[PDB]
């Protein structure tokens, strides 16, 4: 039937209130700062290396992805802020690599493009981190993976941090070997010069493409040949495109220039015989009834004041409709059913500290979402986990452990978004990074640490007051201020969205408004895989 009317969420905020004006101004300042930083990261290695990249007839890497995907298609870039002030004097825009999800010939493909304008395309340790994150996104979601090889190889001064470990560079080839055994098609397009470790990236591909007078593959370079042998050889005579397409047989297609290689890539993807099948149910899409500059005004920059998380769920779902599950029992957690772009979503959000009733409500809701095969969207705004003697007497530990067990055993596509603070073990309960969500984005006001700066400063102040009163010396106000400034300063600097996103702890600082669109894009890629049956472990009753 699906025809009767249903009430909807949402409250029109007081746009004249000075709290709204201050929250709106401060969040707008954060978003403008984000805008100008990503416009500086977009240029890449600078105009000198861009001139030397276009003087060789090479398309710039963002132009390569622009000519590769379907015309007019949205590109979802992942981890644009990697390597941001991560090395001391070495400015590495984008990590050196451009990874994202796009629509190629009607198929959602995962694209990995070596930016050669930044340090010769050399692999930094953060470049390997970003690449392995992209490859497990492609394996979780069953996305066909496209590589645009134009590297330079590991970065020798940092070679330890690139070479031997489990999640170091060689894992890349592991990821291409396993994904080929699962029918997830791997295409490599040699547009540059992979050398001596990176030459396995074209050689382990199910179907390969190379470019004449521009693309070289060899396991050993002309310096290594001139040192070990003494035979002078060039690059094109040693591992050029004519040699590899005609004699050795490493490359499978041959391309005149860059546009021909991207055209051939689209042909190879079109002949993959892939047909998308959704097992979830879809309703005809709709729109939120409230705009998202109101999310600028509602949420704001200060983490001291709380807000209602329902005013976020009114702004991001279809029709602003939301079936709230167990609405009065433990209202520090808001769990309900909504739809984004037709997809059914089970939305879990925070409203305060987590009592035991909140953890029981969360465990029940995650079990419902895994029994009905509904995806889960977690929204994190956490302060902590409700300290007190009575609550530890009640067994607040086993209830948080039940929520952690049900979140970790869940097989549905989970997506985390950190709309505020994310501190401590509550971060584990609300499906943080270590619990394998599909995607994890953050907002530019978020903070993430092991505790807040004030919590660390105040428990260290009380503990040192306790041990000095056992000692006997005078612990004054100035000693307390000299005790409290570096703890607050360190937890503020290292809890930033830019500190967390300089690594690949999160998949990218996103704008609040774009939040709605971004979630839809994320969920679309996550529905490219069939949904497995969830089986939980032992619930500690």
């Amino acid at each position: 039937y699906h025809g009767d009317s249903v009430a909807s969420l949402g409250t029109q905020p007081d746009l004249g209130s000075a709290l709204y004006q201050e929250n709106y101004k401060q969040m707008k300042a954060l978003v403008n700062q984000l805008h100008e930083r990503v416009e500086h990261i977009k240029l890449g290695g600078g105009e000198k290396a861009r001139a030397l990249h276009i003087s060789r007839g090479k398309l710039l890497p963002r132009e390569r992805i622009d000519n590769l995907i379907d015309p007019g298609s949205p590109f979802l870039e992942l981890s644009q802020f990697a390597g941001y002030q991560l090395y001391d004097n070495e400015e590495v825009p984008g990590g050196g690599i451009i990874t994202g999800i796009g629509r190629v010939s009607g198929v959602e493909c995962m694209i990995i493009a070596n930016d050669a304008t930044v340090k010769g395309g050399a692999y930094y340790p953060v470049t390997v981190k970003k690449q392995l994150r992209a490859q497990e996104i492609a394996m979780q979601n069953r996305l066909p993976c496209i590589y645009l090889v134009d590297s330079g190889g590991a970065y020798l001064p940092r070679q330890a941090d690139v070479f031997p470990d489990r999640d170091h560079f060689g894992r890349t080839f592991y990821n291409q070997a396993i994904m080929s055994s699962k029918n997830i098609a791997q295409i490599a397009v040699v547009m540059g010069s992979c050398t001596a470790g990176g030459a396995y990236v074209p050689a382990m591909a199910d179907e390969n493409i190379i470019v004449r007078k521009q693309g070289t593959i060899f396991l050993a370079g002309p310096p290594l040949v001139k040192a070990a042998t003494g035979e002078e050889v060039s690059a094109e005579d040693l591992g050029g495109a004519d040699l590899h397409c005609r004699k050795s047989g490493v490359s499978d297609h041959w391309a005149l220039d860059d546009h021909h290689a991207l055209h051939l890539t689209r042909k190879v993807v079109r002949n993959l015989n892939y047909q998308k099948k959704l097992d979830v149910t879809i309703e005809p899409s709709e729109e939120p009834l409230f705009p998202a500059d109101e999310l600028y005004g509602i949420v704001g920059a200060n983490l001291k004041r709380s807000f209602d998380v329902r005013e976020v769920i009114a702004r991001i779902v279809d029709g602003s409709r939301f079936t709230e599950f167990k609405a009065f029992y433990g209202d520090t957690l808001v769990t309900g059913f909504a739809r984004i772009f037709g997809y059914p979503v089970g939305i879990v959000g925070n409203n305060g500290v987590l009592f035991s009733e909140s953890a029981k409500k969360g465990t029940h809701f995650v079990q419902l979402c895994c029994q009905r095969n509904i995806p889960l969207l977690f929204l994190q705004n956490i302060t902590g986990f409700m300290v007190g003697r009575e609550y530890e007497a009640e067994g607040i530990a086993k209830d948080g452990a039940k929520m952690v067990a049900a979140v970790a055993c869940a097989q549905v596509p989970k997506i985390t978004l950190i709309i505020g603070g994310s501190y401590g073990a509550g971060n584990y309960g609300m499906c943080g990074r270590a619990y394998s969500p599909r995607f994890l984005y953050i907002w530019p006001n978020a903070r993430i640490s092991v505790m807040g700066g004030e919590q660390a400063a105040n428990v260290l102040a009380t503990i040192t007051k306790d041990q000095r009163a056992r000692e006997g010396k005078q612990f004054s106000s100035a000693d307390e201020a000299a005790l409290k400034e570096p703890i607050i300063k360190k937890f503020e600097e290292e809890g930033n969205p830019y500190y967390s996103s300089a690594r690949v702890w999160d998949d990218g600082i996103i704008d609040p408004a774009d939040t709605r669109l971004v979630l839809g894009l994320s969920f679309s890629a996550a529905l490219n895989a069939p949904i497995e049956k969830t089986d939980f472990g032992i619930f500690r009753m």
Binding site: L34, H35, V38, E39, K42, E63, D66, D70, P71, G72, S73, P74, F75, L76, E77, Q80, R103, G106, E108, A255, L256, D257, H259, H260, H263, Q275, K276, K277, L278, I282, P284, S285, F341, G342, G508, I510, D511, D514, L517, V518, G520, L521, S524, L527
Partner: protein, 210 residues
Amino acid sequence: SRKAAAKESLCQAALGLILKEKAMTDTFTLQAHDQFSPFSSSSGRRLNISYTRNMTLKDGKNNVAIAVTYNHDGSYSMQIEDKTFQVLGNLYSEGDCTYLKCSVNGVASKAKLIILENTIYLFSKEGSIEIDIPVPKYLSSVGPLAPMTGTIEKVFVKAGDKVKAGDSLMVMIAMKMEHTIKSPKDGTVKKVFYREGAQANRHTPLVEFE
């Protein structure tokens, strides 16, 4: 004689092409299982940044580069040489004809949009303009080697000749199998390296073009 197109007319041609590509995207979606989904809207919505598409249109003999920025509100900002136009519009049908509805810098117009192979036709009440889409080299490109190690029966051409593509240059027999070489290339032969009755080997060059 033919007159050059105005920059506004190039904006209309670029918009018609972009909307035609959208139409193809929409009719693909109508056949998809994954209906209503994002990626189907040809919005060009990049994350935190804008998308600019650089296309080239051929106006008569001359090429013009148009940089099309996709705006968040569905409009386009098209910069042709230096001048930026605010370009909006859509397609609509009346019977069996497709019309392009434009608004360029606040100036509304309507023209019939017909795209036949490479040529964009705009039929308006002030004239008719034909703008061509350039064809890339790798769609318009369509010396020789010996197939095996055999003896040559008959040569055909010498230096100073001219053959056109799909021409017999040589016939060679290799373990009793008559192989007639042909020309993918073109021009004039400068040297024939093997005279008739000699032994040619595998992947050995037969003739040459200078």
